[PDB]
């Protein structure tokens, strides 16, 4: 699945529709980033720039100009075609093919932006710019505005009003279109298949990074070259480190391994976490903690629907957690008192859900304490977890256990659709999967 | 294989040995880099910082202070241990374990560098700083020097002499120690195994990125999580694009595929290029170009030894190339005249070799036109290639052919050792390898 040219047009028009008359929106591409000396990291386009173009090149600027409610045109600044540069650093789109390829009215060379931008802003009343987003963008924009401000004798005028378009554009990104939901759906499938692979390949003696290797390769087999975030493979006590990325230890028989990995498909993020036994068999202690986390997830999956909020569902999860922890002797006291004291905090110290989209931790207003009412089209994760420190003062069998189970869902008219349920999470199903794979 | 604590000590001492008395060398770690929004690229330590520590954390500064020819001490600035930050973004070394772990005399919190650095520089005559390397480092250093310059009433004095240590440190990196050569040797083995995999997995119908996937996974199986540079898989006309990284096309029966990929093992780079037929069988036209490139490589491999230079060996390669191109009718005229005219330039437009080490395009002075005399310990690549544009005015069968064959070598006392010969390059051997793999 993918995003059509029409969709890109719709998005631009939807932004223009909210812009004042006599204004221009400036959206800059992400700059290239050095990995070491003269080598660069694989390029990653700025999410917002990508959202409006699907164009994967740096040194590009999208200019949306609105004359009035029925008139608006676009200008794209991008790298000029250069026989030399291209024979070296890959083919470039250029000005000639840009208009048709990206559906823009006009295309100019990025090398001429300082000679052209002020001319496009001259006479307008408002300019939409994400100030502070990129240093190079601010230089270009500030330089253009200064020329207009100081050019009264040349009859130039600078728009006195500058508005940050991030709030409006991110509000748009918060609601996925059918096309986006289709792409995210494929991202979930690919990511799930990867997690299934990891579970089937896992064997005591293998290192954490080995599972990382299996996962990244599965992403690649389906057209998702890069992960949407650095893969986490924490076995044993490493499972208690929320963003453990070293993945440098030997996985040990008897430990659990927590894998949080997600592919990036057509710019969209998959985000799954599955915790399972390295030897394919949950111990009683591991099961007792796992069950609490799984119930939290399953209940949350049942509750999420339009009308509720992340804050409200989180309340149910906290109750489930405090109750289970008390039954196991990890927490002592009255459930309700413990809840009012957030006694679960030492074991579940992060949120239950976050928006998901072009960025794994997607943009969009959450509202105070993430109280915003959910509506159809919003995409989010559901990731309860329990992490018991190696030195926690609880029964020995629970110390050093880190478990998280995370699925990605899209809110629908009547509830939600689980995009990542194709990879098992019920203990009996996880063991069966691993046992079946081990017959080879 | 790996780098021992002793080696790190030796390197620091070797740098101190070249420093003036009453001076301090400041070596900064690489800053973290954003991939998108709140997600970062996997961390990559600055090569020079790594060379002296093998420490993989950002916000760290190594300070080597030399009192005189027999007295010198070290101070490391690094992130303080924080229960919160670590439960989230991985374990930190901290000040307590640093001295023993990294073999430094003293360790202070990076958060206090602006309150401590000027005190360490006060009274010294010289400070070694790679000015312009990192903006954050320059702020810290300039801030410290200003405090000393303006603090005469507090009896503070700033070293009036600032020296860039890059020339001296890179000259050191230019010559590998036995330990380094052992690590690079393993890097070559791992990289070679990956290229062998790609050749064995290749099938018409597969996409370029699929081979990228096989390669990266093989790197990972042997402990090399990341590539030393972005993998290049150019099939067909894509082979004519030197740094083609899109790897987005379907590999076609009848085309050649050029793969340039290298792992990063213990910070060191592998760098191999192998071009082969997608269908496992070289056509006559493909063979005629391949042979010229292979002869260039084999001859170069025979010539490289102490006493010669990259410039000199390149001369032999140019002769081989011009001769072969004339025999095929791609070039017309007298060999020697064509050579004097660099008539090969349109088909071989890059260098034959580059230093190799902690950076794929390693540091070190090449001398005018890369004329520097080679000595034992230098590590470099040998990568001749011929690229015939799709629209080149030559016999049709040669248009759109891109071939490069690259090996990594270390200059020895009597010649050189090929670190990447474990992956075949002779045509008959490439076809045999592929035919054997295709019986499955």
């Amino acid at each position: 699945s993918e995003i059509s040219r029409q969709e890109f047009q719709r998005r631009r028009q939807a932004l223009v529709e909210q812009m004042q008359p006599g204004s221009a929106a400036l959206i800059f591409a992400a700059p290239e980033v050095t990995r070491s000396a003269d080598s660069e990291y694989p390029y990653r386009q700025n999410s917002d720039f990508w959202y409006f173009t699907g164009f994967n090149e740096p040194e590009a600027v999208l200019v949306l100009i609105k004359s009035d409610d029925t008139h608006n045109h676009s200008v794209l600044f991008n790298r000029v075609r250069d026989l030399t540069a291209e024979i070296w650093f890959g083919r470039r789109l250029g000005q000639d093919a840009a208009p048709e390829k990206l559906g823009v009215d006009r295309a100019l060379a990025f090398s001429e932006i300082n000679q052209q931008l002020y001319q496009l802003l001259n006479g307008l009343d408002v300019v939409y710019h994400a100030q502070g987003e990129y240093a190079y963008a601010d230089v270009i924009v500030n330089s253009a505005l200064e020329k207009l401000r100081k050019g009264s004798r040349q009859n130039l005028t600078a728009p006195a009003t500058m508005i940050d378009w991030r709030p409006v554009v991110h509000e748009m990104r918060l609601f996925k279109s059918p096309e986006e939901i289709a792409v995210l759906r494929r991202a979930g499938e690919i990511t799930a298949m990867a997690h299934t692979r990891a579970m089937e390949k896992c064997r005591p003696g293998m290192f954490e990074y080995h599972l990382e290797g299996e996962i990244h390769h599965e992403f690649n087999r389906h057209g998702a070259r890069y992960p949407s975030y650095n893969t986490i493979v924490g076995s044993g006590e490493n499972g208690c480190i929320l963003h453990y990325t070293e993945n440098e230890c030997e996985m040990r028989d008897g430990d659990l391994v927590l894998i949080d990995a997600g592919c990036e498909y057509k710019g969209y993020a998959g985000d799954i976490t599955r915790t399972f036994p390295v030897n394919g068999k949950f111990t009683q202690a591991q099961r007792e903690i796992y069950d609490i986390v799984l119930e939290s997830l399953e209940t949350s999956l049942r509750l999420y629907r339009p009308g509720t909020s992340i804050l409200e569902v989180t309340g149910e999860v906290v109750r489930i957690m405090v109750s289970g922890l008390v039954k196991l002797g990890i927490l002592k006291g009255d459930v309700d008192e413990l809840i009012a004291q957030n006694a679960h905090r030492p074991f579940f110290m992060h949120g239950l859900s976050h928006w998901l989209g072009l960025d794994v931790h997607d943009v969009g207003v959450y509202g105070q304490d993430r109280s915003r009412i959910l509506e159809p089209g919003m995409v989010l994760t559901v990731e309860p977890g329990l992490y018991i420190a190696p030195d926690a003062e609880v029964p020995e069998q629970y110390r050093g256990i880190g478990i998280r189970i995370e699925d990605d869902i899209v809110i629908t008219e009547t509830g939600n659709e689980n995009l990542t349920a194709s990879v098992v999470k019920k203990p009996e199903e996880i063991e069966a999967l691993m046992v079946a794979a081990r017959k080879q | 294989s790996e780098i021992s604590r002793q080696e790190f000590q030796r390197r620091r001492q070797a740098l101190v040995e070249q420093m003036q008395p009453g001076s301090a060398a400041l070596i900064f770690a690489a800053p973290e880099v954003t991939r998108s929004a709140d997600s970062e690229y996997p961390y990559r330590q600055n090569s020079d910082f790594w060379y002296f520590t093998g420490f993989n954390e950002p916000e760290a500064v190594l300070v080597l202070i030399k009192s005189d020819d027999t007295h010198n001490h070290s101070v490391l600035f690094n992130r303080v241990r924080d229960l919160t930050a670590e439960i989230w973004f991985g374990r930190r070394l901290g000040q307590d374990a640093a001295p023993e772990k990294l073999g430094v005399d003293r360790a202070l919190a990076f958060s206090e560098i602006n309150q401590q650095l000027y005190q360490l520089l006060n009274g010294l005559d010289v400070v070694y700083h790679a000015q312009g390397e990192y903006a954050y480092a320059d702020v810290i250093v300039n801030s410290a020097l200003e405090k000393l310059r303006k603090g005469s009433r507090q009896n503070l004095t700033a070293p009036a002499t600032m020296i860039d240590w890059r020339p001296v440190v890179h000259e050191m990196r230019l010559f590998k120690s036995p330990e380094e050569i052992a690590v690079l040797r393993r890097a070559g083995e791992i990289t070679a195994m990956a290229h062998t995999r790609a050749m064995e997995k290749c099938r018409p119908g597969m996409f370029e990125y699929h081979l990228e996937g096989e390669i990266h996974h093989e790197f990972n199986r042997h402990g090399a999580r990341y590539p030393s540079y972005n993998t290049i898989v150019g099939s067909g006309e894509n082979g004519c694009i030197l740094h083609y990284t899109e790897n987005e096309c379907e590999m076609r029966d009848g085309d050649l595929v050029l793969i340039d990929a290298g792992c990063e093992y213990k910070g060191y780079a592998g760098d191999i290029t192998r071009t082969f037929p997608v269908n496992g069988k070289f056509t006559q036209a493909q063979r005629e170009i391949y042979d010229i490139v292979l002869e260039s490589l084999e001859t170069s491999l025979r010539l490289y030894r102490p006493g010669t230079s990259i410039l000199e060996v390149t001369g032999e390669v140019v002769r081989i190339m011009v001769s072969g191109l004339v025999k095929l009718g791609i070039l017309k005229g007298d060999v020697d005249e064509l050579i004097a005219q660099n008539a090969h330039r349109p088909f071989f437009m890059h260098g034959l070799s580059h230093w190799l080490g902690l950076d794929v395009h390693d540091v070190g002075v090449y001398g005018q036109d890369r004329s520097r005399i080679l000595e034992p310990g230098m590590v470099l690549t040998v990568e001749p290639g011929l690229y015939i544009a799709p629209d080149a005015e030559v016999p049709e069968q040669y248009r759109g052919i891109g071939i490069r064959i690259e090996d990594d070598i270390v200059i020895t006392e009597t010649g050189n050792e090929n670190l990447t010969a474990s992956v075949v390059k002779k045509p008959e051997e490439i076809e045999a390898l592929m035919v054997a793999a295709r019986k499955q």
Partner: peptide, 4 residues
Amino acid sequence: XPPA
């Protein structure tokens, strides 16, 4: 994962 966990919101950073």
